[PDB]
Amino acid sequence: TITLEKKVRKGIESLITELKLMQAVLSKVSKVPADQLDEGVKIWAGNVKELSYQMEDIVDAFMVRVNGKDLHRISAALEEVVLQAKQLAELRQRYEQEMQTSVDPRMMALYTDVTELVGIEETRDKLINMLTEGDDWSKHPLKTISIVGFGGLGKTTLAKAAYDKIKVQFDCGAFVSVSRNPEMKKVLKDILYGLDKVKYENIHNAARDEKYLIDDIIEFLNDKRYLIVIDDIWNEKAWELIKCAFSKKSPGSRLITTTRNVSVSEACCSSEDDIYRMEPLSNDVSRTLFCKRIFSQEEGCPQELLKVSEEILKKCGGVPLAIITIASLLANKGHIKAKDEWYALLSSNRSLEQMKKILLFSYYDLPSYLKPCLLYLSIFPEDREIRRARLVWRWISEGFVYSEKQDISLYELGDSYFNELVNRSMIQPIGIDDEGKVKACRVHDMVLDLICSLSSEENFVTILDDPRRKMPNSESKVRRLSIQNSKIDVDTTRMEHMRSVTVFSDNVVGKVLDISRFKVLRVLDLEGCHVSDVGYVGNLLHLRYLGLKGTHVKDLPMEVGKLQFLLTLDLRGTKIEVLPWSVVQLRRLMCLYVDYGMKLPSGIGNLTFLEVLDDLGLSDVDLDFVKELGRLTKLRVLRLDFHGFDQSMGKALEESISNMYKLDSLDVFVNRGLINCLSEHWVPPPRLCRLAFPSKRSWFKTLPSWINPSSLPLLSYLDITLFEVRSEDIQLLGTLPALVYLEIWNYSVFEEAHEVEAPVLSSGAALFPCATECRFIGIGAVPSMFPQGAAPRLKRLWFTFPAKWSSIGLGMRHLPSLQRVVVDVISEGASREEADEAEAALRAAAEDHPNRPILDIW
Amino acid sequence: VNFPFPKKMITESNSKDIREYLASTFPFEQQSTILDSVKSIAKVQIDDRKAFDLQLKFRQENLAELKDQIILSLGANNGNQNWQKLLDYTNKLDELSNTKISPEEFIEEIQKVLYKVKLSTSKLYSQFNLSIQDFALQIIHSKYKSNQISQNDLLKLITEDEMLKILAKTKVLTYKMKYFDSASKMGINKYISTEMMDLDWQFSHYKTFNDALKKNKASDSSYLGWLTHGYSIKYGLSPNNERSMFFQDGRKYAELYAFSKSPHRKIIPGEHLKDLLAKINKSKGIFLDQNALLDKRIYAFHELNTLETHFPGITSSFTDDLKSNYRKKMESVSLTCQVLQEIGNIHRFIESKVPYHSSTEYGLFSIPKIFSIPIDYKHGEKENLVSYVDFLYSTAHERILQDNSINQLCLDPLQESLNRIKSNIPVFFNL
Numbered sequence A: 001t002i003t004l005e006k007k008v009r010k011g012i013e014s015l016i017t018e019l020k021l022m023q024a025v026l027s028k029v030s031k032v033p034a035d036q037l038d039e040g041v042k043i044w045a046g047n048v049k050e051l052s053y054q055m056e057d058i059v060d061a062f063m064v065r066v067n068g069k070d071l072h073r074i075s076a077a078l079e080e081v082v083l084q085a086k087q088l089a090e091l092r093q094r095y096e097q098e099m100q101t102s103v104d105p106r107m108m109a110l111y112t113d114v115t116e117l118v119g120i121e122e123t124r125d126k127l128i129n130m131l132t133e134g135d136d137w138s139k140h141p142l143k144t145i146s147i148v149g150f151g152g153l154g155k156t157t158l159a160k161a162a163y164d165k166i167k168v169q170f171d172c173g174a175f176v177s178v179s180r181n182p183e184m185k186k187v188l189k190d191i192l193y194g195l196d197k198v199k200y201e202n203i204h205n206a207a208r209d210e211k212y213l214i215d216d217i218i219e220f221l222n223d224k225r226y227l228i229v230i231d232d233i234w235n236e237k238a239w240e241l242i243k244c245a246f247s248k249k250s251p252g253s254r255l256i257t258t259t260r261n262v263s264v265s266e267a268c269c270s271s272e273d274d275i276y277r278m279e280p281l282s283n284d285v286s287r288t289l290f291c292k293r294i295f296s297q298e299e300g301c302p303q304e305l306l307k308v309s310e311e312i313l314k315k316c317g318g319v320p321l322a323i324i325t326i327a328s329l330l331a332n333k334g335h336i337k338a339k340d341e342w343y344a345l346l347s348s349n350r351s352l353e354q355m356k357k358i359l360l361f362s363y364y365d366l367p368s369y370l371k372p373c374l375l376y377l378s379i380f381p382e383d384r385e386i387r388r389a390r391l392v393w394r395w396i397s398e399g400f401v402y403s404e405k406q407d408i409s410l411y412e413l414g415d416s417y418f419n420e421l422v423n424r425s426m427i428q429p430i431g432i433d434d435e436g437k438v439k440a441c442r443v444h445d446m447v448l449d450l451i452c453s454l455s456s457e458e459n460f461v462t463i464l465d466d467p468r469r470k471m472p473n474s475e476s477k478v479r480r481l482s483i484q485n486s487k488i489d490v491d492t493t494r495m496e497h498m499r500s501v502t503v504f505s506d507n508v509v510g511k512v513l514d515i516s517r518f519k520v521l522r523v524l525d526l527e528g529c530h531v532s533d534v535g536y537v538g539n540l541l542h543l544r545y546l547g548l549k550g551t552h553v554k555d556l557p558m559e560v561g562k563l564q565f566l567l568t569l570d571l572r573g574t575k576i577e578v579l580p581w582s583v584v585q586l587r588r589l590m591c592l593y594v595d596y597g598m599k600l601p602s603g604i605g606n607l608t609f610l611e612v613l614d615d616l617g618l619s620d621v622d623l624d625f626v627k628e629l630g631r632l633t634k635l636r637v638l639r640l641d642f643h644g645f646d647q648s649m650g651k652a653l654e655e656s657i658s659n660m661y662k663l664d665s666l667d668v669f670v671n672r673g674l675i676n677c678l679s680e681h682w683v684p685p686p687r688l689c690r691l692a693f694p695s696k697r698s699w700f701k702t703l704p705s706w707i708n709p710s711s712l713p714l715l716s717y718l719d720i721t722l723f724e725v726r727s728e729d730i731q732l733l734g735t736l737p738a739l740v741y742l743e744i745w746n747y748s749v750f751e752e753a754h755e756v757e758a759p760v761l762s763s764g765a766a767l768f769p770c771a772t773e774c775r776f777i778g779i780g781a782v783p784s785m786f787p788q789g790a791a792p793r794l795k796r797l798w799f800t801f802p803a804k805w806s807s808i809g810l811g812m813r814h815l816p817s818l819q820r821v822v823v824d825v826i827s828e829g830a831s832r833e834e835a836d837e838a839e840a841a842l843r844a845a846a847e848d849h850p851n852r853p854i855l856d857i858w
Numbered sequence B: 001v002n003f004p005f006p007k008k009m010i011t012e013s014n015s016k017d018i019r020e021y022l023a024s025t026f027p028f029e030q031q032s033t034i035l036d037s038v039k040s041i042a043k044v045q046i047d048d049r050k051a052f053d054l055q056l057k058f059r060q061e062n063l064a065e066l067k068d069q070i071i072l073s074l075g076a077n078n079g080n081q082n083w084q085k086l087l088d089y090t091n092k093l094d095e096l097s098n099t100k101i102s103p104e105e106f107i108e109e110i111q112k113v114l115y116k117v118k119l120s121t122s123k124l125y126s127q128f129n130l131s132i133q134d135f136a137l138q139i140i141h142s143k144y145k146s147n148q149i150s151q152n153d154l155l156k157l158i159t160e161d162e163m164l165k166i167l168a169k170t171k172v173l174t175y176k177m178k179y180f181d182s183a184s185k186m187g188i189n190k191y192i193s194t195e196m197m198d199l200d201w202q203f204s205h206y207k208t209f210n211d212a213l214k215k216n217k218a219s220d221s222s223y224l225g226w227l228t229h230g231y232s233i234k235y236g237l238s239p240n241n242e243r244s245m246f247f248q249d250g251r252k253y254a255e256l257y258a259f260s261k262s263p264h265r266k267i268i269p270g271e272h273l274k275d276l277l278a279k280i281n282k283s284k285g286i287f288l289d290q291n292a293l294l295d296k297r298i299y300a301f302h303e304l305n306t307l308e309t310h311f312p313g314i315t316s317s318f319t320d321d322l323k324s325n326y327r328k329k330m331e332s333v334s335l336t337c338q339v340l341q342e343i344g345n346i347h348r349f350i351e352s353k354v355p356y357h358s359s360t361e362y363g364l365f366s367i368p369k370i371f372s373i374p375i376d377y378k379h380g381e382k383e384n385l386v387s388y389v390d391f392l393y394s395t396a397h398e399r400i401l402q403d404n405s406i407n408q409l410c411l412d413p414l415q416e417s418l419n420r421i422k423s424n425i426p427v428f429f430n431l
């Protein structure tokens, strides 16, 4: 039986090498647009993909289950898959026989008539003012503007409009377009030929290197005012090289650039005030464009078509490209289509092919390791929004995230992937998480349709709706399933090799299908369903992600200890009370979500690698527990509850916390009273970046001593409720380097009967660098707070003002960037005649400010 | 057949008779009525000193009676439950109850007994425990009313956390144990609000504490309300069958308090405020659709009512409130619950009129047999009762709004109760 072991080891190593080679080939193939592949390579690539799936499964089985029967099965599968690989190779070799270029579809749009653009005037004039901006604009240094957004939004159209409008007030200008994979010689020759068609008429035939072309451009632009537009920049090196030709200084010249990428725009412009962000049209403008495109002369929509029109316009989203293409589709110049045909289109040609080809540029440009992470978005329903933590943990579980470096955490890699997807304008971010990051994301609908078609053409994902998207006609091997309409019934007797199941139905029939037959699973996601108990979760042996959130589960089988591979375990909103003991024996576990009302077993110190722990109970617990807490060393998020926890042992807890070197966020929730932990001389962890005490009824005393800017060099969030605030407490907050967000409560003002005291700031300038929001709830003063001009980035101020102090000046010209102020007045001490006086006074003080912020007196 | 509603406008003439009748008969003395809201039913002339020493005698008799039962329950017990321990508890109970002592000693011993009763074999065992706690805090209330204890110390006693976590537990559990079967047989248990618990003479003392906090610290009063509603949901007075969004969790009260101190948070909400307001709008929508089930609408009403009564203005959204016009609906349902509770009180009082009902119909130790209000029909009673029920229904029929979307929750309970009452009043009036 020894030789069995050795043979199996050898076979597995061979499979690993073969997998590397296959992935290299597939990544190489998947770059070519579909119009340049031939059928042979496409078919062969599909078959290679299937073989890759099978070999991955075999390798994983060996890694998990390692006896006689297992080794025998593994050897059988090994032999079979090797045979199939050889056969496919011969097949390809048998029928191999060796035996122009199209133009960019976006080129025709430059010759569209100008009387067909609907709502440009406003944006056009705003951009023109952003360019000139004054009377002596012809004497200021060179300036660069940039425009960003997603495809089809109308960037080059706006640039063309402004250029044609104001080109008269310059000496020379050009309008050049850079593509995805550019040749720098061609770009420089284009600039030269655009500057003077007569002198450099034959410049496209010259053969010099880039240095001499750059020298020519520099010599021609000497002592001239120029306006130059550069279009469709796709990465950084291109701009880094082209920037050399505009190195000299020339008073009065202007540059414009347009792009889809945000970092490129940050690299072009100097200040973040020189960035224009395109935004979609409003509803009325979109509707007029629609009507003008289809009902062109009548401009009268019949009534029966109103509501389908409105739903279609909502699906378009205000993007002119989609509006135009769908309007041409429904126009059918011969005849307007019928209402039922409109419905059919809504539920579900040259212009359509062009739009698809245009939008796919951003997909064909991604790095190879980001393409699966994008297709994975086709699992979720249409219009809802997606939590990012869910996405990141599922990506890690599926195996899309990996690296070879020794000192890297997969969580931050996944976060980087998400931020990169947002950077390329393919995802709309929404909200702010409770750990300082994005909360959720949204996807445009046409993009969603493109993604669904792409992922369906490769058996990446199979969706189950009843009206559309039924079971594939001829497919025996399905890997990832997504149940959205519970009306259907499922066979699930041929789906031996599943990998991931997800149910989106509130329906009872959703829990009907049997799961214990998918002997190889990695992702089980039943969030929201009404399943009641799962005893079959053991015997799965392959899981990585177990998501049970918002389900009616009362208790877990005491066999989860068998799942030696289990990254995530999500239990929130369930009815569980006490976790089974065997949970201690899950050595690989990186994330544990739980409610504070659940009892944890004793030996929690064994769970190293824990990177996220949510809502510890910390009640009815002895000391060895709080000492074990000090062993989880690589832990980046923590949340406590202090509910029944006895505040006599806080010192051990603070030592255990100070033991965690890597850490970003921290919460402490306390019902009432004085917080008896985190005493002075604590030495917080160095990398801390976010701190919060959301209690609002449990105070600190004067202030923690460890808030000095040396101990907490990094901090971008703070939320504290003190007992009594001093005047030289805000000073210590001025000392903090970053402190983007801040919120302080004065406990004595509300709960006790103390009165609002005016704090005074002194002895310094630039007190609050990078403070965009401040909420001094309980204590307020506008002028004396900010002397000389400090915090030149604030945008929202919250302060309190007694009506007694009607007779201090409310001048808002210390602070340039003000945009919003929320005030509340205390009127019992002073009479109403002083009250309305102070009201009108601060109103005028807000009106004088040039930015003209908004007020609220409350 | 449905008996038609009485249609009378309230007269000071019969007001006099009904008023002295309520002021004379025992159970209606310590309770107040909705009819106090009427224009002219004035002239109460009541003094609380006599009612107070009456309560003293009642408490003495009830503690003595339960002690009597405790000895014999220790005599023959099915698995010894250390009943002499509860006996020592009632021993120190009577001790503290009889003597005058210094305020500090009373504080110490009250806290000791209360904190050690804090920490399942028999059911009436637990009933005895609950009655011990209730009698202890009743002693507290009487002692405060006896001017032997200041206000400062009373607050320092009640405002500390553990006492707050006990008041609600007792206030809900005792009411359940005492009135649940009566409410079920009467068929009104589906309309039982924690808001109107302290309107029975059995729970007047609680009310005192309540206004005391409204005296001094409104924050703690609102906290006590938010606590008692959660405790009521927990012990199954109102089953929702899945989960409560915002009542059992500690981090929800923090958000509510934060909003209550600086309201502008509602305009610029955080995430927890966001999903709070989303759940509120969802429950509102559920409450304002007529062919949803009754239990869901009642549960939604109870939750929204508690939120609005303790944290004012959070449930309000200006525009849609007028198109829905649900505010007056809320007031109508509240009025219905109050009047239904009073009708149940009257129905329970009727049992005192039975020739053979020595057994109390209110609950364990509700009334000591030393008083045991008798069967003696008096001159006024036979007229005053029917007049009072007719006046109740007449006063109610006016303020209720009439629309079938809202008719489902306020009209038919009143109609069914009027039917049951008009059917059973005579048969009891004969014999």
Ligand SMILES: Nc1ncnc2c1ncn2[C@@H]1O[C@H](COP(=O)(O)OP(=O)(O)OP(=O)(O)O)[C@@H](O)[C@H]1O
Pocket (backbone or CB within 6 Å): A106, A109, A112, A116, A117, A118, A119, A120, A150, A151, A152, A153, A154, A155, A156, A157, A158, A232, A260, A289, A320, A321, A324, A358
């Ligand atoms: N205000 C408008 N009214 C009517 N049509 C418009 C308007 N703005 C843009 N369009 C149409 O949208 C189509 C695409 O716009 P355009 O190509 O300028 O966007 P883009 O930002 O250049 O896209 P990409 O980023 O792919 O280059 C053009 O055919 C243009 O006719």
